[PDB]
């Protein structure tokens, strides 16, 4: 069953940021903000304080949030997964982060590629990931059920969630 078959992220697996593969149905019943994500983006500061600012207000309701390092948008994730993971520390992050990924070309990991075809009709626009700090909202299905880009930040996500919570 290739990934373009997949019905959820939960059918899913991804190496975390310490090494462990992590099969994602782990986030089955949780609302998940899926991003890509890079140490020297002009939008790293804004990203990683209100993506654990979030993590630490709705955790309580059901909010995970799975970081992805990415190196493909302007060479702006070159580190190694432990300087990634320290970098993250620095923010306090509590959230769940994993090992350095591409999100597009041939080589994307799996997941990236599936959920850049949701919804079923639609998917993302040219099929790529525009820049660092895409995020996608994933319900308890494992669903995507809304895409914000680069540009917004994730504050703008909040509004948004009580109707998957």
């Known amino acids: 069953d290739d990934w373009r078959c997949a019905r ?3 059918e899913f697996s991804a ?3 310490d090494g462990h593969m992590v099969n994602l149905d ?3 019943g949780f609302v998940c903000i899926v991003t890509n994500v890079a140490s020297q983006c002009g939008k790293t500061e804004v ?8 993590h630490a207000r709705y955790a309580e309701c059901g ?8 190196n ?8 190694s997964n432990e300087e990634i993971k320290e970098f993250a520390a620095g923010y306090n992050v509590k959230f769940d982060m994993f090992s350095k990924i591409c999100v597009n070309g041939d080589d994307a990991h799996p997941l990236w590629k599936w959920m850049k075809i949701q919804p079923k ?10 820049w660092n700090f895409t995020k996608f909202l994933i319900d308890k299905n494992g669903c995507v059920v ?12 909040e509004k948004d969630l009580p109707h998957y919570f």
């Open 26 to 28: 782990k986030y089955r």
């Open 8 to 10: 959820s992220m939960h």
């Open 63 to 70: 909010l995970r949030i799975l970081a992805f390092p990415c």
């Open 121 to 130: 009709g639609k998917g993302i626009l040219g099929n790529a990931i525009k």
């Open 146 to 157: 809304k895409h914000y880009g680069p540009m917004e930040e994730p504050l703008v996500i």
């Open 47 to 54: 990203n990683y304080t209100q993506l654990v600012d979030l």
């Open 72 to 79: 493909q948008f302007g060479k702006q994730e070159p580190g």
């Open 15 to 17: 190496k975390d940021i």
